Design a binder for these strands. Sequence first.
DNA 1: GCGAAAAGTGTGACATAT
DNA 2: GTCACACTTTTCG
DNA 3: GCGAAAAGTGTGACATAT
DNA 4: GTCACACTTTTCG
Lengths: 197, 197
Amino acid sequence: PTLEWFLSHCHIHKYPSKSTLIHQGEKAETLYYIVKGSVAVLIKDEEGKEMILSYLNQGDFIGELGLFEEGQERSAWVRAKTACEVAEISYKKFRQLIQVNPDILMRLSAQMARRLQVTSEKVGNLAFLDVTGRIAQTLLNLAKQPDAMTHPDGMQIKITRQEIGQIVGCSRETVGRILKMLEDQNLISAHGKTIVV
Amino acid sequence: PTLEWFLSHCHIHKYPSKSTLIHQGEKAETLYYIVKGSVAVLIKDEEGKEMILSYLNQGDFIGELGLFEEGQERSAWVRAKTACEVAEISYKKFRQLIQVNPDILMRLSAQMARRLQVTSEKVGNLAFLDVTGRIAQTLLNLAKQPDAMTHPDGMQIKITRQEIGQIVGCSRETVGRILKMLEDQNLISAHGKTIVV
DNA sequence: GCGAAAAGTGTGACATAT
DNA sequence: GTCACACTTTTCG
DNA sequence: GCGAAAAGTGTGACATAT
DNA sequence: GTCACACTTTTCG
Ligand SMILES: Nc1ncnc2c1ncn2[C@@H]1O[C@@H]2COP(=O)(O)O[C@H]2[C@H]1O
Ligand SMILES: Nc1ncnc2c1ncn2[C@@H]1O[C@@H]2COP(=O)(O)O[C@H]2[C@H]1O
C-alpha cells in the first residue's frame, strides 16, 4: 500500500539466476527492493574464495548502505540465487519519497537493524564456535530460511557442501567430513538435498 | 540542530568507568545517546570468552536495534570505557519524535548503516585473515580512532595485549607473541602503549 | 523429462597456525 | 590455544 | 613524584582443528 | 585446511 506507492516510482528489471546484480567497489546510486526472488550477498578474499554474508529474499531492500552519504561505494557483491524481479528507484528519488512518507524509511531501518543484529551474531559464531558447531547452526537456520520443503520428519533444504563452506568458513571437503559425522549420528540425512531432522 | 530538540526530552545520566549500562538479554525499551564519553560494545560466550564488537564514542546512539520491533532483547553488552554522560529516551516516545521530525531517524539510520558496513568487514577479517593480519589491521585502525596521540613520527595508542586479544580473537599470549614479531619486523614499537609506525 | 555437458564431490596423506 | 608462575608494568592514594 | 596494590604479562612446552 | 582426479550428481538446451 505505502509499498505500492513506493513501487510505483520504481522500475522493475528482471535478472536470471547467477546474475551479479550489484558489485563491490562501484558507486551506489540505486536502492533495490526485491519484488520477487532470492539473492546472496558476498565478500571475496583478498586474492581468493568468497564468503556468503546472507541471503536476502523478496521484501528486502539491497543497496541501502550507500543511501545515507554521498560518494559511497558498494560494499559487497549481490548475486541472484533464483530469478528475480528487482524494483529500483534512485537515491535522490528515495529521499523525496522519504519526505512524502516516512514509513518506507522506517521499514528500511528495520531491515538495517536486523542485518546488524544477525551479522553481530556471525562475528560471535566465527569467534566462539568450531566449524562443526557453525555447520550445525547453519543447517538449523537454513531449515528456517524460507525455501526448505517440509519433510514429514524433518526439514529439507537443497544446498551444496561448497555453499555451506562459504557460509561457515571452511573447505567443501571439511563440510563433507562433518556432514558425514552428523549423518552417522542420525541427526542429518543428505544427497545434494539435506534433511535437518 | 534537530539534535537539541531531541535531547531536551531525554533524561541525561552519568555512568562511571566500567559501569555496565546494557546487559545483553535485557528487554529493549530505552534508546540512549552518548553525550560524552566512550563505550565498548561486546558479546561473550556461555563459557566466558568475550569479543569486542566495537568502541562507540560520543555522538553515537546506543540501543537503536530494538526501536524497530516490539519486544526484543538487547543484542550485546555495552560497558562504559570511561565516564559517560548518556542521554535516555523511552522507545515509545522516540517513535513520537520521528513523526515530529524525520532528520533524527535519518541521523540514526546513517549510524546503523556505517555499522553494518564495519561489522561485515570484521566478519571478513575473521574468516579470511590470520591473527597476524587481524592484529595488523587492528593496530592500524586503533591509530586512527579519536584518542590516538601522536608520537612525533608515528601514532601512539595505549591498549593492553588483553584488549587487542578481545578485538582480534586470540589469547593475550598470542597477541604478545605476534606483537614482538611485528617489533623484529620494525612495524610496531611496544612497551604497555604502542607506537604504530 | 530427456541426455550431454557441466558442476560438485570423496578420498587419504599431509602440514600447520593459535 | 593452553597451563601456572613469578615477573613486569600501571595505576593512584 | 613516592611507593605499595592492582593490573598486565612472558614464558615454554604443549594439544589441536581445519 | 591442502592437493588432484575419478566418480556422482545436477544443470539446461
Ligand atoms: N552484512 C550484511 N548483511 C546483509 N546485507 C548486507 C550486508 N552487507 C551488505 N549488505 C547488502 O548488500 C549491499 C552491498 O552493497 P551496498 O553498499 O549497496 O548495500 C549492501 C546491502 O544492501
Ligand atoms: N556490531 C555492532 N556495532 C556496534 N554496536 C553494536 C553492534 N551490535 C550491537 N551493538 C549495540 O549494542 C546494543 C545492544 O542493545 P540493542 O540491541 O538495543 O542495541 C545494540 C547496539 O546499539
